[PDB]
RNA sequence: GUAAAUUUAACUGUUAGUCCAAAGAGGAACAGCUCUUUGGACACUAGGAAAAAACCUUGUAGAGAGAGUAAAAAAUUUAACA
RNA sequence: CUGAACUCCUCACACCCAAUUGGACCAAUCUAUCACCCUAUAGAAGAACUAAUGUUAGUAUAAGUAACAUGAAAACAUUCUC
RNA sequence: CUCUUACUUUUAACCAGUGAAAUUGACCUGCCCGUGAAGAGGCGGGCAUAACACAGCAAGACGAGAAGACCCUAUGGAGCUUU
RNA sequence: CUCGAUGUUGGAUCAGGACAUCCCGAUGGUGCAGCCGCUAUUAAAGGUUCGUUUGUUCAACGAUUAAAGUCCUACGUGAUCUGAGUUCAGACCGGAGUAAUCCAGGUCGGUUUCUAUCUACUUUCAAAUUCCUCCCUGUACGAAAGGACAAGAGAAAUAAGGCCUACUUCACAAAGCGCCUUCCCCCGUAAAUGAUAUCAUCUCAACUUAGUAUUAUACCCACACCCACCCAAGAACAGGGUUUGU
């Protein structure tokens, strides 16, 4: 019975582990977990926690590029919040449409 | 169970599929009975199915020993040396055709818990993370509150 | 892989020779420390307020009555100083404490019954082993050079001291003799319950509080009696007449030092500092040193006139 | 608490203890050597030493004859005390007996001891002997002694 | 510099650290000020010990923690340092620490009367 | 008061096999220089003590054949003589106990 | 100290429950949905 | 808008109820109290309210080292006066 | 932003309620006929035990615990003590 | 009894020999507060914590023992009395 | 919740805890002159008697005390005790009933088992509390009667921890009826300077004082001669001594 119920905990504890490793890799670049995940979705980059945590360990130069992208998209959001719509959208804030 | 059983890491036999694919199934030994209701499905597999199965798999040597027996079995031997014995007792032809084909597809490695669903010998390409990966260097490599030229 | 003692392989002729040999060496080692002021002593500072000097290690002889000039009777305890020396000195820094420690030993014992590490410590010190070694906390201005002998005139009459020693061992005892419990009555139906503790705790807690008074081993621990004055000092035998009783049995080693009680604070202004040196004394002391209110045996009979 | 208690608690009481010690002493005077438990012998050894002191006082001393009459149940041994044992230790002032420990007996594995009167007519016990003077250690000490004696005379 | 920590509010007086010796009447309660004067590293040590996971590894993490009341540090521990973490709180400046430029940069807001004694 | 639960063999092995329960090796054993048998340093040799008791018993059986009854102890000293020995100069006026046996080598005539 | 008599969340003397900020927002989010449901059920 | 309903044939078990909301009775506008009614939950799973049968979220079943969500954290600091 | 067994994703799907009820399979044993290193189709029945202070037997725990025993020396003749 | 004390014997503890009984779901068998079938070694939050024998104690294990003898129920029994 | 048992009065023993304080401490108010009191704030370190009748808890009474506190702990504590009471089987009195028998009734009598498996505990090492006496003093106060505080000194009781010179029980020793020692504090308020509010105002204004201890210091602190023997050490183990191992 423990082995049958442990298949829900394994999946849960994995995602908890990934998030802890992403949080740690984002603080090295002066970012917080919500600002990385939330702003990578705004750049249409659909990378899950498992892959992100693997990149922070084995591809550090790629994870800093992803953090700089999230920080760039985050700063464009603030700039747009100061304007009233007149200023155009940012370069990395554009959205590719699929019909 | 995992704690009550052994485990292994995902692997292959002689880096199979890297340069070429080599079928690991090396030998098949059937033991059917001329008489016996248990072997009815095995006899019909030897009349129409086994001959066409050997044409497709020329690297597998198939032995059919018809002798008195109450439980017919098929023994599969693989290149790595593993031997898997299975029973075709009171099984239809369709059930024995999917089983034999399963044996041909397998590698011989023990069917036990696999720790990771992936394996790579070169996991990193930019450098495995270490504490000093994202740390900046200081002038003259000094340490916190270290008097230089004292 | 079998243990051995000092006279296991010796013959009938060598046993007396070895005994006398090591006996004569102890005599020479003890008779070579009687001149500490000529053997390059350390500086002798004067007494300053807030200073703490060394104590002694004496042997409890027994008890004796003592009468004063008012007629009242006092009982005293005889503490004999025998083979007391300073073993080593540790500075405040190396002491890991506010004060500085001075080590003192007493009562020469046999060298055949001590540990090698202890024997070599005395070998370089030029002294025979000691039975008991006690540590005294002193000030920097009271340090004494190791190997210096110590005598009973280190204390004076009219001075209060603190005596520490192990108490008499009474073994495993019940609560009536160990803690003063009343017990249970003898008759009126009592069933096999006359010297038992009774209830040990309440039912609610479901346990017994730490520190609960139960039967166990009593005595054979260190206890200190504060506020004991010196009535008399004998210099011929190095004996200290202390007021009242002291912990421990007869012929036991006791630790003596100035009293810590606030009432007797800064009363060592007229006392020897750091210690009494007979070798350099400009004049020898009398046989015995009495207190003002003590009536000596030779003195005439008391008369309330 | 037993501080200072010198006498043991054996038998069925104080009187039975004296009666046990008396039967061992009486047998020791008849045979001059006996084997018994170690504790019971160590407790009787003192009485065997002081019994000889009463035999040196003479058979004319009433007090000495009243002790032997009580401590010797067999009355043929009383003349042997005054006429045989006491004269034997006339020159000696002490150490009339020797006590030695022997292997524990089989029945109850009790600690045993043999006690005898020195000067008896019985085969000598295998007494323990100290190492010879000709051994390595004793020869190294004999040489040290000579020098210390030779230097002192100088 | 664990002796120069700063508490917010009135926590030096209000905050209490409670313990028990196990014996009857052995329940003690001291304030943060009383504890700080008696042990200048207890407050920081007790705050960290309460933040670590409640497991056996915690006592091992506490051996790797080194606290010093003053700015003095042993040579050995000072030779194996790598990085200095930034202070979380920004220490505000006293009015005697401002330069004459910032004082003159901040404008005066009101015009006091000339006949006021102050 | 009765046991609330059954104690396991794991708990019981730790109590039974505690070093305090185990037998301690003895280092006071040595060989007897006379017979070569083993002995303790503070205890007499069982073998040599046994041969003294066999001979002592034989001598005590001869003493009984001379007294010929109880309450018949002598008022003189006693001497043991063996085949090939005669009363010595100091063994005059004593009770000689004749033994039909060669004098033991360990038994030295005094 | 701090006993709630009986069972916590039943009876006369209960353990007090306080409304957090997200609990308010969660309820308001539901209301905005159902308010727009009233609009489409009106034509 | 939905897919159930009635009849016929043949049977067993259940018939010693708990809290929550609401309308009331009794008691003392006490009870984790007692008695009716309407509905819910529990006596089946999971998540949350600290631990939690009765409150909130959520139900149809497996494997996954994928993802989006539901409910879900407590706020507050006080008395001058002609 | 975190957050379920809710929902989506890859593949699969009869595969989470007490009492009660319906259905699909089956171990071993005997018989008929097969089979012939241990099976098949059927027919039968003393047909399946983690629990009844269950029955009998074995062995643990308590526990090597509680408790039990021989007057002394010696020549084993005898004597001594009580 | 105030108010206990000392000694002796038995018991006792240690060595040797012989060797029971009730009891026992499994146990790797801690403390505080809180919770809960309303009184927790086992749940929550905290604190404590190398391993191990022997001798003592009796606060708890709602400790062991006897399917409560008080109380109520059973269309369960029996003894006695009687208009 | 517990009837395949959670043993129920009071007392003995040992007490743990709360403060809503009986005494002792520090303060405010008084219809507080003083001596005694009433009232409120703060304080739980320490302490809180012996007896006659009653099973009693309570209560009454006698003699005392600085005071003879209120409560909780399964109306604390029966695998520690007690069984007088209550509460079986016997019996009497009164009453009820035809009787059997029964009663808030009263009365005499009536068996209190357990070899500790587990948890817990078995030296919280060491600062002490109070009364009385003398003196201040017949002083302050007060019409009179009456009658202090502080300082100082001395002598005791209890408690804790030790000891055997004598006394006593005793006698190589253990004991008390005997002797010796015993050291800090706590906070309620009362007052200065001085703003908000140019007086004033002790200030959850900045601040000063009565007014504070890292409770002080003390104790402990070495280590394979160790087979054996002795011991003021001890259940065993351990410990001390053997330069007293015929
Ligand atoms: K408890
Ligand atoms: K409630
Ligand atoms: K006595
Ligand atoms: K108990
Ligand atoms: K029970
Ligand atoms: K019951
Ligand atoms: K004001
Ligand atoms: Mg003792
Ligand atoms: Mg008594
Ligand atoms: Mg009885
Ligand atoms: Mg009795
Ligand atoms: Mg005996
Ligand atoms: Mg509750
Ligand atoms: Mg119905
Ligand atoms: Mg209800
Ligand atoms: Mg999730
Ligand atoms: Mg679903
Ligand atoms: Mg499905
Ligand atoms: Mg089958
Ligand atoms: Mg069949
Ligand atoms: Mg059956
Ligand atoms: Mg079975
Ligand atoms: Mg059964
Ligand atoms: Mg036992
Ligand atoms: Mg016994
Ligand atoms: Mg007996
Ligand atoms: Mg035994
Ligand atoms: Mg049971
Ligand atoms: Mg509880
Ligand atoms: Mg025990
Ligand atoms: Mg008991
Ligand atoms: Mg029943
Ligand atoms: Mg009936
Ligand atoms: Mg009937
Ligand atoms: Mg039960
Ligand atoms: Mg109060
Ligand atoms: Mg009190
Ligand atoms: Mg009670
Ligand atoms: Mg009890
Ligand atoms: Mg009675
Ligand atoms: Mg009665
Ligand atoms: Mg009547
Ligand atoms: Mg009677
Ligand atoms: Mg009893
Ligand atoms: Mg006065
Ligand atoms: Mg003012
Ligand atoms: Mg002003
Ligand atoms: Zn021999």
């Amino acid at each position: 019975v423990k082995c049958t119920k442990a298949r829900y905990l394994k999946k849960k504890n994995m995602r908890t582990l990934w998030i802890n490793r992403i949080t740690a890799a984002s603080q090295e670049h002066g970012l917080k977990y919500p600002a990385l995940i939330g702003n990578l979705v705004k750049c249409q980059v659909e990378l899950n926690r498992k892959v992100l945590a693997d990149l922070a360990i084995y591809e550090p130069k790629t994870f800093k590029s992803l953090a700089a992208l999230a920080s760039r998209r985050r700063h464009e959001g603030f700039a747009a919040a100061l304007g009233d719509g007149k200023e155009p959208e940012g370069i990395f804030s554009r959205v590719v449409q699929y019909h | 169970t995992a704690r009550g059983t052994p485990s292994r890491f995902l692997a292959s036999v002689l880096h199979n599929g890297l340069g070429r694919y080599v079928q690991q199934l090396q030998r098949l030994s059937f033991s059917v009975s001329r008489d016996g209701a248990s072997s009815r499905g095995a006899r019909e597999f030897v009349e129409r199915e086994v001959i066409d199965f050997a044409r497709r798999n020329p690297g597998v040597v198939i032995y059919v020993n018809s002798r008195p027996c109450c439980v017919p079995r098929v023994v599969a031997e693989y290149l790595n040396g593993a031997v898997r014995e299975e029973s075709i007792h009171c099984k239809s032809v369709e059930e024995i055709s999917t089983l034999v084909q399963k044996l041909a597809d397998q590698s011989g490695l023990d069917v036990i818990r696999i720790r990771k669903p992936f394996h790579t010998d070169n996991p990193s390409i930019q450098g495995q993370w270490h504490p000093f990966t994202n740390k900046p260097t200081t002038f003259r490599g000094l340490r916190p509150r270290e008097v230089q030229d004292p | 892989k079998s243990g051995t003692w000092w006279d296991e392989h010796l013959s009938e002729e060598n046993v007396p020779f070895i005994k006398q040999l090591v006996s004569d060496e102890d005599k020479a080692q003890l008779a070579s420390k009687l001149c500490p002021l000529k053997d390059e002593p350390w500086p002798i500072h004067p007494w300053e307020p807030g200073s703490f000097r060394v104590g002694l290690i004496a042997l409890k002889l027994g008890m004796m009555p003592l009468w004063t000039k008012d007629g009242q009777k006092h009982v005293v305890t005889l503490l004999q100083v025998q083979d007391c020396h300073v073993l080593k000195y540790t500075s405040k820094e190396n002491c890991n404490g506010k004060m500085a420690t001075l080590s003192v030993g007493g009562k020469t014992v046999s060298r055949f019954r001590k540990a090698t590490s202890i024997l070599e410590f005395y070998r370089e010190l030029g002294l025979p082993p000691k039975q008991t070694v006690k540590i005294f906390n002193i000030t920097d201005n009271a340090a004494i050079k190791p190997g210096t002998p110590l005598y009973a005139a280190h204390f004076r009459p009219g001075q209060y001291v603190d005596v520490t020693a192990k108490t008499i061992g009474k073994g495993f005892q019940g609560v009536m003799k160990r803690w003063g419990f009343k017990g249970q009555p003898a008759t009126h139906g009592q069933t096999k319950t006359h010297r038992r503790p009774g209830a040990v705790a309440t039912g609610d807690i479901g346990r017994v509080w730490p520190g609960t008074k139960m039967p166990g081993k009593m005595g054979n621990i260190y206890r200190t009696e504060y506020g004991l004055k010196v009535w008399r000092i004998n210099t011929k035998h190095n004996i200290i007449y202390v007021n009242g009783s002291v912990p421990g049995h007869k012929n036991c080693l006791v630790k003596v030092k100035d009293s810590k009680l606030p009432a007797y604070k800064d009363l060592g202004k007229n006392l020897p500092f750091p210690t009494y040196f007979p070798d350099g004394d400009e004049e020898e002391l009398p046989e015995d040193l009495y207190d003002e209110n003590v009536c000596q045996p030779g003195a005439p009979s008391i008369t309330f006139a | 608490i037993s501080h200072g208690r010198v006498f043991r608690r054996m038998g069925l009481g104080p009187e039975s203890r004296i009666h046990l010690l008396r039967n061992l002493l009486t047998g020791l005077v008849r045979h001059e050597r006996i084997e018994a438990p170690w504790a019971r012998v160590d407790e009787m050894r003192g009485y065997a030493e002081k019994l000889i002191d009463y035999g040196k006082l003479g058979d004319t001393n009433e007090r000495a004859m009243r002790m032997a009459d009580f401590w010797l149940t067999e009355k043929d041994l009383i003349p042997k005390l005054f006429q045989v044992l006491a004269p034997r230790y006339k020159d000696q002032t002490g150490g009339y007996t020797r006590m030695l420990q022997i292997p524990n007996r089989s029945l109850d594995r009790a600690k045993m001891a043999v006690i005898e009167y020195k000067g008896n007519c019985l085969p000598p016990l295998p007494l323990p002997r100290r190492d010879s003077h000709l051994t390595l250690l004793n020869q190294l000490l004999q040489g040290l002694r000579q020098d210390l004696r030779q230097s002192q005379e100088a | 510099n664990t002796r120069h920590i700063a508490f917010s509010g009135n926590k030096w007086e209000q905050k209490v650290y409670s313990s028990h010796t196990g014996y009857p009447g052995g329940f003690r309660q001291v304030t943060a000020a009383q504890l700080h004067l008696r042990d200048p590293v207890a407050i920081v040590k007790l705050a960290i010990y309460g933040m670590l996971p409640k497991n056996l590894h915690r006592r091992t993490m506490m051996e790797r923690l080194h606290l010093f009341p003053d700015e003095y540090i042993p040579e050995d521990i000072l030779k194996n340092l790598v990085e200095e973490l930034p202070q979380p709180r920004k220490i505000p400046k006293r009015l005697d620490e401002y330069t004459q430029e910032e004082i003159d940069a901040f404008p005066r807001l009101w015009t006091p009367p000339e006949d006021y004694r102050l | 008061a009765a046991p609330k639960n059954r104690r396991t063999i794991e708990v019981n092995r730790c109590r039974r096999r505690n070093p305090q329960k185990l037998i301690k090796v003895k280092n006071n054993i040595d060989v007897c220089p006379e017979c070569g048998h083993l002995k303790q340093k503070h205890v007499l040799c069982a073998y040599c003590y046994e041969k003294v008791c066999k001979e002592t018993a034989e001598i005590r059986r001869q003493i009984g054949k001379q007294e010929g009854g109880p309450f018949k102890a002598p008022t003189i000293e006693t001497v043991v003589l063996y085949t090939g020995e005669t009363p010595s100069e100091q063994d005059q006026g004593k009770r000689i106990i004749e033994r039909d046996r060669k004098r033991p080598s360990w038994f030295t005539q005094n | 100290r701090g006993r709630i008599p009986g069972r916590q969340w039943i009876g006369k003397h209960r353990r007090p429950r306080f409304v957090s900020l997200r609990a308010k927002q969660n309820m308001i989010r539901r209301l905005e949905i159902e308010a727009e449901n009233h609009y489409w059920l009106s034509m």
Side-chain angles (χ1 to χ4, degrees), chain C residues 116-149:
Chain C
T116 301
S117 64
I118 297 180
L119 292 185
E120 64 183 25
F121 164 77
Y122 290 100
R123 186 176 57 180
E124 60 184 24
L125 188 58
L127 286 172
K130 304 295 185 186
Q131 182 173 352
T132 297
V133 180
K134 294 300 179 182
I135 303 175
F136 293 85
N137 288 351
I138 63 175
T139 52
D140 294 2
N141 53 326
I144 305 179
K145 181 180 180 180
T148 297

Side-chain angles (χ1 to χ4, degrees), chain C residues 29-41 85 145-149 151 277-280:
Chain C
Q29 286 188 333
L30 291 174
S32 53
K33 306 284 188 174
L34 297 180
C35 307
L37 295 174
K38 295 178 180 179
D39 290 4
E40 294 177 350
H85 293 89
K145 181 180 180 180
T148 297
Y151 304 96
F277 300 96
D279 177 38

